[model samples]
Target chain A: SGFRKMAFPSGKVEGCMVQVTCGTTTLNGLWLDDVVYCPRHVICTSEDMLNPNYEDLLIRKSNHNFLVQAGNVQLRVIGHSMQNCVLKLKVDTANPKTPKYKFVRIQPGQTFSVLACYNGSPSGVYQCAMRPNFTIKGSFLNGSCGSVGFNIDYDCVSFCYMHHMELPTGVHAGTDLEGNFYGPFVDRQTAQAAGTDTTITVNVLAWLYAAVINGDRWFLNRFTTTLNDFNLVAMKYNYEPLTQDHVDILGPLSAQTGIAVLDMCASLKELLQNGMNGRTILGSALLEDEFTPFDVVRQCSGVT
Target chain B: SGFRKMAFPSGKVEGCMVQVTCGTTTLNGLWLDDVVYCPRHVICTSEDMLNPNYEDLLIRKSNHNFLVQAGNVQLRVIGHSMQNCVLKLKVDTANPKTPKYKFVRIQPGQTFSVLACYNGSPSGVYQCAMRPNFTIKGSFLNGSCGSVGFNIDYDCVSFCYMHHMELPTGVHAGTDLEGNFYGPFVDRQTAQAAGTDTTITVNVLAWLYAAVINGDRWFLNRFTTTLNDFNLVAMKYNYEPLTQDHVDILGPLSAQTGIAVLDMCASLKELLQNGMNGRTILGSALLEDEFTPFDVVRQCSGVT
Candidate 1:
């Protein structure tokens, strides 16, 4: 009801390049008749994109098909004559004075493959594609398709590429991160349609860590050490402790992830605040653990 | 097929005295046309007791009708003119050389009301009556409606009175106490009809204790202390410990009763061996807890 579903019913336009700019970062993809194929991902809007005058659009990853919602975004579909079919994207922006982040809820049995993209610059693109497998309950996260600038405060940006990863699957009928109660959803579509604006931004590093250490004894032990290091860094910075609402939000996820959710939230929040300095604490450990390639980690750390 | 079903065609036997003698203890009751009313209990034979020539009989409690099967017993219904209508009763006795106890499989939802009867002597009578309510899975016990002499070895005899008590009710589809596997029974009657000789005797005192301390936290704590005392007495007597087969039999019952089955078996076995000495340990505790009256405990302890 908030954003008009966008679609493209016209014939195919080969070699048509579509560029989507959320803030500082721009994502370029190949435009087919109805689908937009990104570098290593796919994008599909809610409705056919033939009607170019729609004010608000709901876009998603074509491959995994997770909703992409963010702030101050612009999308351009370039056709045969290099004509700019520019569409103004609507965003449920946080208040400028007392700003709060936007979030996208990921349903259970839903999987996401996040790629931290860098074209040799301090600003990098983060592409998150979702695949809803068997929805039992909805998972949560903040800003899906947006600039790194918007995510830096929440630390939703990732350094390493995360393969298809599943969140904890269960009847997660509880209050969200914003203390707003989301009742039980009948199915995935029902949950996705009831698009609530207030949600948590996905902590990419913590989630990536969850995937890495999942069910692996060696990796689990190493993660404990990594968590200890992060905790020390957080202590030095005197970061605020996780709020009760944040802890409540992480409760089920933490039990399934086998990590203390509050500690992870605090550590990741601190990691975002200190920038490159905090990245070393997390990134160096990941490198030592050989979880990701050095080049990818470097790009993710914005060390280019 | 084992015994002929007896019945009474003619009615009217007023002021009739029916006496059943199994070993030294004789149970005296009032006889009508079909039913025999005992002093504090009621006895109902399988078939009407009108036929005078039936060799074997299956008897039960009229109030809470549980089957009563035991050793060599005799039944006599005396009517007008002091006529002795004596009937020879059949018993499935254990061999003298290597005797084993007989058990009655108590079906789930089946309850038993046992009275430890003592007409002032070393030999006492143990009357067990059964009531089958909702049959699910059959429970187990050694004997019912017999002299306490036969139960000395298995320690199924009781000192104090046990009101209607229920066993662990569930799909107890497992082997019996004697290590003979009895598959699932369709109903209580089906299980009763397929009478297997190999079954465990009921430890009346232990079962009585089970009923008393069912869900009381304070009683549970006191029981732990009582168990410790019994364990010491068992150790001193150097009695044979409970077999693995016995432990297996007690597994489900123990889980439901919240007691160590093996320890209870061993302690009860020791209590039987040391006679009145072992009685002091268990009886004192039950008396101290005021679970039963002192007079009843004294009778149960065989104190004149």
Candidate 2:
């Protein structure tokens, strides 16, 4: 067993502080691949320490919070206001596996500290509990003392690495710490090549959620607009046409990522209906997917 | 037989006159279609009459000179300088069929006149001779008189309308007044259609020359630069790829029109060799051949 302490300055006032002490325990099982894949790291700052809404408690600050937010077995907090103070707070875990708390304080705090402990396990699943309490303990010299409180928030996380064989053809998949899945990550060259499977089903929201979790900004930025825009980009990068399955996969992904796929597809369908000058539109559409002009020219000329 | 006389004010002077008398005669043969297809109308003004260099005789002024310049059988001029005058002149026919004369005068001109006759023939080929002479034959009160003269020049011309049967497939041909040929007039739709013949041999210069003669500016302006430019236009208008024969025809045509076809094709071949970004260049090239933006969009969208 081990114990560690962390401290933070309290409120907008100086000379007061908030501290967290985290204790660790060796779990019954070994970690997957002996690697610590802590996908979620959440921190509840002093700002959250005074907020009453549980939603307001989810904050990010430092890695020190990962243990309590993703793997702690229990959480407890003691608030002491040495001078006149006021505090009110609600603390909880967004994940069902963690603990929750509501607290209020009317007193002044000289300092605040948190003591916590966690157990790492091999199941690749993690959970933590946060208990926050606010209280007024000292008498006010002016006949009234304000409240004081502490805040705690936890996020349950899980992870597993899937082999290539486990992934469906044409897909390069990934998952969020919350176990939400994302992707069929295919680029133009890959999409144009043979062996791409269009039969696989997918959760577009889950895919986008996973993309967000994994920090895939490029994927998000490239296709979160219109189907025409997507097509133009695809055409520029030599992407093959999207199959029915690909469209279906993107339907939810588009919504979750940004624009509505239905609306984009509708616009595209309308364009396809006007056949007389389809080439012109196609030509014009190509411009929207811009690239370095001379590079494109040189690429076309086989010079580069 | 018919006779007509016309007069013009001489030099920069207000009163003295220059006159001509044209007489007509019926030739032995009837005109091909009885349609006076006078492809060449030559006018030799008094300016030409005063200049001795035969090369400087080609001038355009009035239609009245057509008889003497295009069909005249003979021409003769008479001049008289009335008050203090001097004249030096030479007159001749650009065509071998007409007469030539060199004359001088020192006097003040009162009036000058030309007597001429012409015979129209059945053969579409038409040739005429112009006889111009300058003379100053009058008293010189100041003892110093200026020179005067008449000018004449003829253009040889021939014309015959060809039937559709006479034209090679894929070509909508025309000929200049000098019999220079032009064209393989094809639009995008026609090019894309199946009946287009790619085997016909053509004279590119003859084609452009004919276009110039026929005032087909649109055709000349569209493809006189780069093959890539041509391709983009063709692509925009839905033109099919140029076949070997088509390229061959264009080779000479390009030279006569403006740019070199070989250079254009070389650029295109280089582009083909660089296949990585062919689509982008193709896309970019499309922009060069711009059209009504909305129209192109609507055309592609099936709205127009």
Candidate 3:
């Protein structure tokens, strides 16, 4: 009941200057309405000397209403501004102090669900006062118990409705229908919204979700037929690229939904074992290939 | 009559530790009486730094009875001391502030002929004192007024003597002897010590003078036969390696005396031109080579 959403009205300020600085270097930007920027590469530190530029950008946009910032075990900010933003969710912390600050950026229409750290107050219980000079109108979305606020599409995760759905590995039957677990079906849909995947298996799941979410009957043939084709294509090229057929079918939908799976296996073949790339595997597993997810899906679906 | 020889007696105080430090780095030495050590690579500088280890060696052996120092443009101290002892000699000044404290180290039997700058007194008119703990017994061998203190050695400088002698390019007699100029021979010695060249023609004159002083009939050949062999051998291989025959004949004598005329040509080859491996020219051109006394005698004898 505590999950909530806040939005900065369309007209706040005409434009703003967001100066992102960390350490000795700074990146500056002057922005207009609806311009989204993410401090993707800014890693934070304690001292003002080592602090990342993300806080500066947020403070700049929020007019220094710095109440939006939270804890360190992964610094997550959740407030709507006049910009498209994305943030990575999900952190695996094994009981530690002063944990990592994971970064993510979220685009429009996508919701962020954060399992905030210890002592973090959920949004519904919180209240913010008015700033007479430059405040935006705020409203909260309905509760999780209601049907209007939530929908579930549990098809084969490969060719499933991608807005949000049940685990595909689950069933389409009586007892196992909705399954025991609940998720946003991010493997295929959110994966596309996320970013490029070099050589990830789940990248194909994005396209399979694309075919169903777009409601293309020819493309999203009922389970049996689609699964057969998907298996024939995706299974053959698990870590390989998809053929042209898969891309031709899912290309338009992925582009429309801002989720194109990519396969950069050839490019990242050498780096799959090193530093950041190794951690990347720990993050997305088969789904995060250090390459574009769209290509992985295309190649997986025989669209290479 | 002031020219004299001073010796560090072989029986003085067993051995001493000689520490030569210039600036910060010190050269350490332990020595016996008459244990000859040259300050081979010790180029002198001001600031009490860059002084040689040679002085310390002498003083150490002399039981700090230092009396073997002389001149400006060079500061040499020969004394044994329980503590540090430094010296500056015969300062003359007409309202001079902060004139440089120059220093040089001289070895035994080597006469320090300095081009005294502004206000340095000549050694003939100088005096010094003794540390009660380190005062050395002083004695004088002879004076500078007579021929006994000086003997001219005219040997093959290329294979002969290189001490003070006639200008190899100047006349041996008449108006040309010593010419109108009278002064130090530092220019030629300094130049040759600085670079290399071969077959400087003055070498024969040192031999000619050697024959005169030595009174060796077979050795002199009146310059008739010796100069021919020298010219034939030296001129043919100017700037070239010495042949087996030439080295075999001259190497022994060159070892006995300090002058090894062979050093001139080979060492000079690399410097003869700008870039690497440049051709070295060897023909007698006046500007390319420095003039020496024996050269003067030959040209004086009609070779010019």
Candidate 4:
């Protein structure tokens, strides 16, 4: 490396003089393979991104991925932020490995650069990656939660818990995440509140957890919580009578869950305030709680 | 409303403890507006669960969900440590106010129970959620994974992540207490490692999330990464001019990329590793590194 001293701007603030210049230069390049094409994932242009499709779903930022390919010609990525790119090449053409790509994390609004064969390919797309930049990818999309109709501010479970709480816990139902159509039985506490939305839906998580955990035990412990409880051989039904099953939701609770509840869970209320008025917490639960949406935690940090 | 407790010493657990025990129970009590034989979701007996089509995919100690009705009887679950007993019930037929069931959670060797009535409906088989008292579920499955020709332990993601991370970051995909399938994705990272199992033929949560996130990216990113770096685009058609398009896997790097000394960007050894060995990074890179398996994270704390 060489060093040179010049009329450099010392410690200057925003008001310091800025230099501007205009110039022109010629660029040329060649590719190992005579005729090649560019890969498909990274993004270099803005046009194609506007009409996103299946290809855009995987992109992290523009010029990084979801790109258009031009084979054989000289190529150059021009941007400091976009420069932190990885180049990927595939060998076999018949069937290339999938989900093969890379990314370089870089700060936003900075310039990035790269030079390579523009497009000299027999087939396939290429990509790169690195951290600290969160994988710069194709076009800014309507990928946000709100645009997709989610309540970014909702408590997620609050609305559903209040409105759909009365879906009385069944005998063999498992936990909510279990994804089973059936469920963990609602407890006496839940059952007592099943008459209204506030009580029924308000405590879905705790209730569901208790229901599944205990239901499993109901059978394992022979349907008895007492040490000397009976064999309870007849208390639990450990069998499947049929192959097909469906947990039909014919009423309001079902409507709330299939329709309204999903919004809360997705945290749509944060974006749209009128979301929480919706559940069956058994006590006819409504917006009696705080306006702040439900979230495990939140943070805003600043430089010390 | 009473104190209860118990433990599993041995033998099959079943039968009527009814009024004698007072814990909660999830019963399939739905009557479909009062039908008998053709219950909404067919009930299965223990024998049926053993030979059922889907149940065949189950691992030992995992939870299974089935439909139950709750219209006819006063069903009550009872048990001190009923992790093994198969709890069953009936749905409340169909009600706008409730779903008649939910997945129940369970603890190891802990006693939990349910209560229900037989009403007039006939008894039938339903679901099962088992737990091994001797060792952990994943450890048990590891033993079975090898024996069953599954390279990875089934449900290991769920059991492992739950115990370790206390989150359900999509690693575990099995069933709820209600027996529904859920917690589908593991993390964006596994999008690459999926479907590369060796010496084993098994599909678990990896299958679900891959479909949701990496499925499409696999094709697009693979193409971009390969094309951008090597200027090696893939071509699907024999006669078409080399261009950037779907079904086009053969191509070259773009102008936006750097054309460093041919040997600088990539080496013979590196290319060979990616080309021949099918290394995870380079292999996944060709498809746009978004799906790198190692980069995938492990987290899940059940459904939100």
Candidate 5:
């Protein structure tokens, strides 16, 4: 019941350069539309950089008030700190004092599942920040739920640049259907009022969702070179890739620019200091291949 | 038909040692008896060099009989101008070879797999020697086959070690599954006999096929500086590991290792040449991530 659904109303802004700001200064929660895809790979990007061409496309919607964009992009952090953690989500282009949107904050060892509201754009750029709290069981999902790694079939995964869905296209769609146990409402249809779409659907279809290619497909965790200062690492399957799902995602017009969710960075040493350890990961299990912080720490320390 | 198996008894020790001793060996149909797992993280060896330890393992195994091995073990080579190429495997205890492995008398841009099988264990070193024109796909199946992006799993892929699998304990007791893809094998008794015979059935299970101990379980893929050419670049996935099933196939094995199937001096350049531009990897794809891409090109181009 606490799940929140948001829509950036069709007529939110008209021409390019129009002001489409999220709430006031508390914009972190006031989701500015994410670029489901950007035109380029996010591997190399400049700080505080926003390709104006992409911004312009998202402003011009083919379906009513909805501006659609589809491409890959990586946003670099201009400046972000605890004082300005949540403001990255705001769309207020006018607020010069506000921090530029570069990375998303992932609390230390904290992994929560929230709907990644897709506005049918290709990719979105966000700033990366370290969360000092929560030392275990942290994850980032492309969809409301997680992608079990089936290559998206473009239904809402590989091609939708600006839409929301309950499921993402990661693995082969029906990889685990025999005794599958991960479904309830991903297929539920939702209202698509286009520009007037204040209606966020449970399973609404959008073109951008399929188009939103994560820069690092299936990348959830990445090991950092900074020793002792634990870095969150993910084990994304790099299949022989006989297919183009991953390539397409990372190719021209990419999704979730910067690195993929599996590649997000968060410090672990801070969590240990905060008493977050293997006990925390063991206390609750939300992932399939997750390790408890204590055990991970022990392993990291070369302990049995 | 796939499950049907065949093997040679005690292997052909006839004249093989003398051939290896004389450096005039020739093997046309040398088949692997068991999947070889390296004793240490690296297997220092090659067909040409003669390290006493690696030499002992090979000569000894040849005398005793071993089918397959994954290492820098030396084997006989044939074909025109074969001496023009150098084969270097990182398992050696010496300097990391310039060009880890190469094909002589074989034209580049041609589709071919190394037919030469490395020497077997005792020393547990990963050794290899030339055996012309043989190709096989050894697997690390928790996910799809082949190298994944630098993710958690790519690190976990046991590329250097090919564990020897034996059928379940009951299989030795002559128990067989009914209506299975395997043969009618006369009766369960036949299955039992094969199970009991170490030579008959070695149930090589995927490292991922088994689960790992969550808290106490130690499954890690670390990057060590000593082995720059063959460091564990990425860990794909820690297959569902079980405390009970966690078997230390590789002795003193504190962690699993991944050799860059592609990072091998020529692999990346070949991939890029053959249409693969760049992939988003999770773990350190390079032995030293600090080195710039230019450095990778430089080093790969046969430089310091």
Candidate 6:
């Protein structure tokens, strides 16, 4: 155990300072099997760290769920035979059964450094979970890997927003973190020009969850109120039989329904005005933009 | 005008009493087109009375909608051309525009007598609307076939019940006053093995309407309560994900629901008991007898 004292700034954050020992500096990355031509690396180059523009940046910020602070640490391949090896770490100390988080590959015979932060408690125990992947074509070199304690609780929200990060976990339908919304749309990629909005909804839901976790009532209230408003409107007029005489107008009731208000003032305004005419009750209307358009071609062909 | 005074038994009804003025009753029945094939005679035979059963009674109680006492009236064919013509009267002198409740074929020849009763008040006008349907051969045997004076407010309700009378005035997916229950069923005739419950539903709906019209609170309440019970039960445990541990024994709840009682007590009992383990709430389960079973043979082979 060790202790250090230093004059740290109020908001000062310490970077992970790790030592790596390797040989030959083969730099041959990694592979899935014995003879495949592939290697995965974790260490960042100057190009990856200094690139400020998000869209043009090639390196992803949240791979393998190893959420770490950017530009805060360094990696030095200190041992020989590091060419074919890769390092991985099991993060959850309380649950030793958690999956291992992988690190970037470094040169077999040289050393490298970069800024980074491991979001773990420094006071806790970290096991070396390092393992080699693919053939290095010579003597094998082992590296330090596995669970560690230096925790920083990396700010994923900030990290994700800044990098406009995306994680293609699985497909159902939703939007992402980038304020950019994606479908849940029909005729998805087949349309004349598809904007291909995806992942935002899921991320937004996750963000909402965090708002609760963080006790951010303002953030929570925004969504909760909108939900209550929608449900309130839906609970009443859900079974109205539609006819031509019915227009896009909604009643004055629930006029405060966030999105509904915007709709009332827009294309659906005329119909809403007509519908609400002299009634105190509010009505609900499913907006065109509010739903995924039916796949016409598929429907016509009876494919759906 | 003369009014009759009589001592009649309670609930006692007599055949129509009438006056007949005619010759030896050439008694020859008239024919179609004034020919000698069909008999178009308006006379009362002793057989018209004394017949107790309604079905065998050939005389219709209502003509021109003036249901009257059967066997109570008779018509006398008049004029020198009496042998060649017959006369019909419009009993409604007030509204002289009603339809003629025609009698069978009659010749200008003989006048006949049968029981008759103009039930309407002598002060009130009765329009007798009459017209000949079939052609009268020679000289177009003229008859006074317009509004006359005759009114018999026969008990249509009683009449309807007695004759099991049918009035075919409109078209819809149901039965009329004939007490005949029509359909909303599949292979209706084949429903012996069928629910055929469909026509029953329609008939009951009609029954319910009449029940409403008749202010049949008991009848109305019976159905209303049953419906409310069904709805309340349906409002919960509907498609709730089931665990084998959950049984069919409902808690102290919906045990009050009629069908639910059966469900909780019978086939679904096992599952129901598990489901209601510790719940104070009720659950709903569809009864087997309550459904129209699908014809497996017809479905699988497309034989249906």
Task: Give the chain A TM-score for each candidate.
Answer: 0.24, 0.17, 0.19, 0.14, 0.18, 0.18
Q: By the lDDT metric, which is better: model 1 or model 4?
A: 1
Pick by lDDT: 1 or 2, better one: 1
* Segments in model 2 whose C-alpha atoms lie over 4 Å from true places: A1-304, B1-260, B273-304
Per-chain TM-score of candidate 3, chain B: 0.21
TM-score of chain B of 4: 0.19
lDDT of 4 by residue, A1-304 (tens): 0000000011110011111111111111111122111112123233433343423332444322222123321223222121111112211221111111122222211111111111111100111111112121111111100000011111121000000011222111111111111123221123322121111122222122222222211111111122111112112211111111111211232242332323221232221123223232211122111111111011000000
- Residues forming the 10-long window of minimal summed lDDT in candidate 4 chain B: B142-151
Q: DockQ values for all predictions?
A: 0.00, 0.00, 0.00, 0.01, 0.01, 0.00
Worst 10 residues of 1 chain A by lDDT: A1-10
Cα lDDT for residue B27, candidate 2: 13
Clashes of each: 24, 58, 75, 293, 120, 105
Deviation in Å, model 3, residue B267 alpha carbon: 27
Worst-scoring 10-residue span by lDDT in model 2 chain A? A122-131
- lDDT: worst 10-residue window of model 6 chain B: B1-10
lDDT by residue for model 5 over B1-304, one digit each (tens)? 0000101011111111111121232111111121111111022233432332433334333222312222344433221110101111122222121112211221111111111111221100101111111111111111110111010011121111111111222110100111111111221111222311110000111111111211111222232222232122111111122112222321112132232221222232232233212221221111111222221222112120
Model 4 lDDT, residue B107, Cα: 27
Best by TM-score: 5
Worst 10 residues of 5 chain A by lDDT: A1-10
C-alpha RMSD values across all candidates: 32.7, 39.2, 40.2, 29.6, 25.8, 38.0
| Model 6 DockQ class | incorrect
Categorize the docking of model 3. Answer: incorrect
Q: Write the per-residue lDDT of candidate 6 for residues B1-304, one digit (tens) a residue.
A: 0000101110101111112222211121111111111011222233432333323222442232222111333332221111112222223222221222232322111111111112210001101111111111110000111101111122211110000001121111111112222222111112122111111111112222222222222211211223334333333423222222121322122222233323322222232224322221111111111101111111111110
TM-score of each: 0.16, 0.14, 0.14, 0.17, 0.18, 0.14
